[PDB]
Amino acid sequence: MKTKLMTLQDATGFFRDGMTIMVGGFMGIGTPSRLVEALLESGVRDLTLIANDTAFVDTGIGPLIVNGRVRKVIASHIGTNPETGRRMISGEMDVVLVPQGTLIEQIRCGGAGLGGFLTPTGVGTVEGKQTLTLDGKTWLLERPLRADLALIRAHRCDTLGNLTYQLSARNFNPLIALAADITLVEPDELVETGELQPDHIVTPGAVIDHIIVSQES
Amino acid sequence: MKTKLMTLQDATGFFRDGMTIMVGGFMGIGTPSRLVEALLESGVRDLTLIANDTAFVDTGIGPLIVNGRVRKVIASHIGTNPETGRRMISGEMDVVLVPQGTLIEQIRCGGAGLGGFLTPTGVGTVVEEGKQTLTLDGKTWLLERPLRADLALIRAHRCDTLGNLTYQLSARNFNPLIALAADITLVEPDELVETGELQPDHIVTPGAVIDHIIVSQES
Numbered sequence: 427m428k429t430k431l432m433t434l435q436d437a438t439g440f441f442r443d444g445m446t447i448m449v450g451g452f453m454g455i456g457t458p459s460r461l462v463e464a465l466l467e468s469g470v471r472d473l474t475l476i477a478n479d480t481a482f483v484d485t486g487i488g489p490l491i492v493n494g495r496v497r498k499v500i501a502s503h504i505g506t507n508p509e510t511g512r513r514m515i516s517g518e519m520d521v522v523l524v525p526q527g528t529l530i531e532q533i534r535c536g537g538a539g540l541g542g543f544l545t546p547t548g549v550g551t552v553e554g555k556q557t558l559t560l561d562g563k564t565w566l567l568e569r570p571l572r573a574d575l576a577l578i579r580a581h582r583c584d585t586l587g588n589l590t591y592q593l594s595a596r597n598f599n600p601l602i603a604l605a606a607d608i609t610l611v612e613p614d615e616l617v618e619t620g621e622l623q624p625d626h627i628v629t630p631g632a633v634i635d636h637i638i639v640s641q642e643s
Numbered sequence: 644m645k646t647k648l649m650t651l652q653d654a655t656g657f658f659r660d661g662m663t664i665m666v667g668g669f670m671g672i673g674t675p676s677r678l679v680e681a682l683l684e685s686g687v688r689d690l691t692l693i694a695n696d697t698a699f700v701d702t703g704i705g706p707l708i709v710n711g712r713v714r715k716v717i718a719s720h721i722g723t724n725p726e727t728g729r730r731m732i733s734g735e736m737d738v739v740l741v742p743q744g745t746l747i748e749q750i751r752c753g754g755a756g757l758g759g760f761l762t763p764t765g766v767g768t769v770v771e772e773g774k775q776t777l778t779l780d781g782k783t784w785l786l787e788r789p790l791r792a793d794l795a796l797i798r799a800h801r802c803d804t805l806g807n808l809t810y811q812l813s814a815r816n817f818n819p820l821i822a823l824a825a826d827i828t829l830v831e832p833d834e835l836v837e838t839g840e841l842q843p844d845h846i847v848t849p850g851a852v853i854d855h856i857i858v859s860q861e862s
């Protein structure tokens with residue numbers, strides 16, 4: 427048997443306190459909002475969330491933060507969500523701010539199964555990381571980032587999990603699909619295998635574990 | 644400089660002795676055939692070629708090798724081309740066999756401006772020879788450096804007049820990868836179309852990294 431097919435109700439079973447979860451979406455755009463809602467309703471806490479940003483208090487992973495479900499955020503920008511900053515300053519939540527280009531490479535590094543990469547980026551800046559001197563230059567050594575789970579939004583998805591995306595909504599989605607131990611997809615459209623043009627598939631079904639089969643109606 | 648459009652004859656003007664060239668293709672598939680023919684006809688030599696493999700004696704970059712135009716090959720497989728091995732043994736050609744995943748990441752780093760990366764691939768084996776390892780979190784990793792080239796010869800499926808490209812899955816392989824890691828990029832498209840004709844969601848290689856496009860069709 428072992429189907430990848432499942433419902434939002436089944437999604438609940440994949441959530442547990444303290445897990446690390448990667449979530450797609452750029453400023454809420456391309457965020458698997460239904461999976462995020464299921465995560466919120468599950469009631470799990472002490473989560474570590476990895477995402478491009480914390481969007482707004484009501485979008486992206488904003489609701490999870492506002493409702494106290496998150497212990498740590500790793501993202502590239504939190505300026506548009508005052509609740510993220512507030513919990514950061516109140517000591518209620520740990521926030522690790524990472525430059526976007528570097529955050530993207532760390533997640534890519536984790537999905538590639540590598541041990542780290544050398545960036546010229548951040549040198550002489552704010553430290554805690556080690557430097558490597560190679561040839562004539564100095565480099566900052568950044569480590570890979572992986573997660574227990576990834577919540578992905580896709581445009582089209584076939585029953586095997588091959589995914590395509592719309593430009594704006596793409597962002598972190600294909601990246602995190604490779605860097606999490608278990609991957610859950612919320613597709614705009616679910617179709618039979620063979621229906622997607624192979625030349626345009628972005629994310630291989632091989633890395634997709636579960637697919638939400640319902641439509642928001 | 645107000646145009647990326649050119650002919651195969653114009654391609655000859657980019658080939659110089661001793662340059663490093665990245666070439667697309669998987670076992671000969673997805674290789675920009677005509678650009679490689681031009682390269683061979685140009686008679687240039689002492690070249691360093693970077694590709695997934697050395698194909699067969701009569702396909703991909705194989706002819707460039709049999710005709711002594713290559714001093715060094717950096718690839719992940721050379722077994723289907725006996726001439727590569729022969730020249731490696733005789734000392735006629737330098738050959739650096741790189742694990743495929745590693746070769747891919749080296750080229751990706753070259754295109755991304757990174758200084759290198761740590762990989763578990765090859766640690767504790769002959770692949771370590773001549774490189775440094777580094778131990779982090781109790782694990783030992785091999786330090787690999789980025790790869791770039793002077794030129795990249797790319798085969799694309801569809802290409803618009805600005806250089807935006809799409810590929811057929813079966814011929815894609817290294818093409819989009821090398822497009823980002825070379826100083827100058829030349830594309831041999833199956834179909835050249837007007838800008839606006841390609842669906843933006845389907846563009847894989849942005850025209851910004853593409854310098855010249857072959858306009859003629861067929862072999």
Ligand SMILES: [Mg+2]
Pocket residue numbers: 625626627628844845846847
């Ligand atoms: Mg595509």
Ligand SMILES: [Mg+2]
Pocket residue numbers: 607608632633634
């Ligand atoms: Mg997996």
Ligand SMILES: [Mg+2]
Pocket residue numbers: 696697698720721722723724
């Ligand atoms: Mg071979």
Ligand SMILES: [Mg+2]
Pocket residue numbers: 825826827851852853
């Ligand atoms: Mg360029």
